[PDB]
Design a protein around this ligand. Sequence first.
Ligand SMILES: Nc1ccn([C@@H]2O[C@H](COP(=O)(O)OP(=O)(O)O)[C@@H](O)[C@H]2O)c(=O)n1
Ligand SMILES: Nc1ccn([C@@H]2O[C@H](COP(=O)(O)OP(=O)(O)O)[C@@H](O)[C@H]2O)c(=O)n1
Lengths: 325, 325
Amino acid sequence: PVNLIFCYTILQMKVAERIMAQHPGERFYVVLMSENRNEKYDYYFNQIKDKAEWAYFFHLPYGLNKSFNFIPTMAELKVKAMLLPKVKRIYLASLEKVSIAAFLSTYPDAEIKTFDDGTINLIQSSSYLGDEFSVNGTIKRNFARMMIGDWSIAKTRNASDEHYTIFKGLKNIMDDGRRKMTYLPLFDASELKAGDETGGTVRILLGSPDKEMKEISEKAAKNFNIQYVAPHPRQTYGLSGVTTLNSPYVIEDYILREIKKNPHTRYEIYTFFSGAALTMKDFPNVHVYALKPASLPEDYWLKPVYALFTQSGIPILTFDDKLVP
Amino acid sequence: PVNLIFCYTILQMKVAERIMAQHPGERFYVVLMSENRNEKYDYYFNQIKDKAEWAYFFHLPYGLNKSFNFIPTMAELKVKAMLLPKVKRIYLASLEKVSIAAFLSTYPDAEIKTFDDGTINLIQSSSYLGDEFSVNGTIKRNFARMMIGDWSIAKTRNASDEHYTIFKGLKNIMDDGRRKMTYLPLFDASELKAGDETGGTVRILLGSPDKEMKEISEKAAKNFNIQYVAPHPRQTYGLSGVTTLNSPYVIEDYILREIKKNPHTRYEIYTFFSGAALTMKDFPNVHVYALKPASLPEDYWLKPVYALFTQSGIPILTFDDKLVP
Ligand SMILES: Nc1ccn([C@@H]2O[C@H](COP(=O)(O)OP(=O)(O)O)[C@@H](O)[C@H]2O)c(=O)n1
Ligand SMILES: Nc1ccn([C@@H]2O[C@H](COP(=O)(O)OP(=O)(O)O)[C@@H](O)[C@H]2O)c(=O)n1
């Protein structure tokens, strides 16, 4: 159980030091956020790093703060005035209307538009009311409590008149009557020239970011005879006995390039319920499979995941990982 | 006149690219804010940096985001759950209740306490109603409009039950009946052992951060025969013909050390109305002077500055800079 202190000036750091020296028995994490860095600043930051359990110094880009901790002069007013950019419109993920809400309000006349955060846009309001979410003090209740509140503010607090979704035909949480829904497809399957699938089958497993799916994954690769793993961008460890595909592209892009180059090849994409299955279903010559490992709990994925997948036409294969050496 | 786009995932960056490619004639600044960095992320960031008029990639500290752009698994819920720190209390500058407001609300049961931003705490509510601030479309009106709103939310939106001020005897903007005011003195003048001022006078000019006070400053140093300049921490250029004092300390600290070491020396501190004069007035053997250059406009400092200074007992000297070679 910790205390936080936030600073943005040297004198505020001296205050942080007085506050800590007054609570010798307490734990402190201390964040300095400042546009300036120099000998003077560091010296007082490092004084705080020596007393705090943890300390971080965000070195922000010049002119992000349009207010002042001091009383400004006509000079200091004019400079900030004429560097403050002139802002007509702002685009952001729906949930960023919550977390970058304080910046939004400093541009009250900017027209706002949002786009999907990701697959989290696809869980509809009522789903967060399910029994799955309604036990108490549980980790699933706290999540639902949170999203319900966050979506509320994203929908009701800084009027934005349009929402971009990348998912064709699945109801969006932001489709609330208060805004235009626009479909914006990220991926161009035309000009690919994909024909009949002769000359072979390439099998790829999508990697999981959970370091704990390493052994399930390796078994999946063996069971279904998959040669390649496409690692998750949030993924950090490796699989043994499976050729990892190293590439700067995300999977969808990489697969689009391969189809262009290999227009007769059957592509099989296996995934533990990654969002990619949803963006990829309709790709020509691509066949997507959800893998549901029997050894994980049933509640390891939220009920809405299963619904979304079968609603989207993706096979959910039961996989008996425990029967694989 | 610009458009902003904010992202926190690769797919959101692809959306940013579609949005820009659809407004070829518009200017874009694009910010990616992400906890992960790698080949995959950079590649898509650099794609955006090639189309945007400007682009910046904040590489945030792990686990700052307690929500999800994807639908999380029981694993992904548990990990975030048990890394999310346990937070009892949060300390921050009064105005940071506005700018870090969205983080505050994600800790609804944390007890909150504030401290002064700086001298800006000393301008009282009504002062922002002055004629000085009440012409229209002016830069001074916009400032007052802004502070009035910011103070309102700092005072009324995330109940905090105590405010620390570093200024003894000057009314604080946060002294609104809704909270305890506590004086927290930053600076220990006792144990200094300052005696009668014999053995000489040391004169120091406080540097201005306005690169445009360079010539006024140099003249001040010459006029009043000041040998040393203490440069501002926000200050970035140098003075000619004045020995700059290089030190990691801020002025108050540095002066405290000097008095200990030189307990019979008279210290004269000259300043164009820096906040330091307010924290320093009562230091033993320190005599502070405000310098008001005749060649600047009268409205270069806000009326409340002058009031605060004379209210605080600091001499305001008229300085005829134009009469100095
Ligand atoms: N192995 C993988 C998995 C996901 N992805 C990308 O990650 C996106 C969504 O994955 P997800 O729902 O498991 O979690 P997040 O990626 O939204 O963080 C997909 O649309 C793919 O572009 C990938 O490139 N390779
Ligand atoms: N030449 C100077 C001027 C200010 N300062 C520090 O800056 C603080 C306030 O200066 P100010 O009101 O001109 O503007 P800010 O410093 O609040 O940004 C003082 O309390 C000093 O600690 C300094 O160390 N040296």
